[PDB]
Ligand binder design. Sequence first.
Ligand SMILES: N=C(N)c1ccc2nc(-c3ccc(-c4nc5ccc(C(=N)N)cc5[nH]4)[se]3)[nH]c2c1
Length: 91
Amino acid sequence: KIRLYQFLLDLLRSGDMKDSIWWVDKDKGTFQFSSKHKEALAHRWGIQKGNRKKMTYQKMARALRNYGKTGEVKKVKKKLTYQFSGEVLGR
DNA sequence: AATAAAAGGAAGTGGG
DNA sequence: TCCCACTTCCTTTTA
Ligand SMILES: N=C(N)c1ccc2nc(-c3ccc(-c4nc5ccc(C(=N)N)cc5[nH]4)[se]3)[nH]c2c1
């Protein structure tokens, strides 16, 4: 099954949910969620995974935070903003 | 207060 | 057995 960081990168590449997520500086890999429209993106993640419960942005961001140590995705000191690693952006 | 963003410990679920 | 890669639950903290 697809990994969360890959789901997000795929969305950013396709533009399919541009009202929920967008690049801030794509060269740096920084991206930002919509305050008002992030829940619809979280719902889509849960449905893609076939999880038992409805996915929420809160639970999706809980998963995102686990990438902090390994480095695939890091939180940026800006509202609803995160940053992919160079490895993730290259691969 | 109401609302939201951010955090993280801990236990549960998948598929190896 | 026991890690993967989250998911789910609950509580706290800050703005
Ligand atoms: N509404 C808003 N416009 C808004 C905008 C930006 C915000 N940036 C925050 C936070 C930053 C740090 C926070 C925090 N540091 C913690 C340490 C420990 C724990 C714990 N559970 N031990 C919890 C913590 N939370 Se909250 N809140 C914002 C709100």
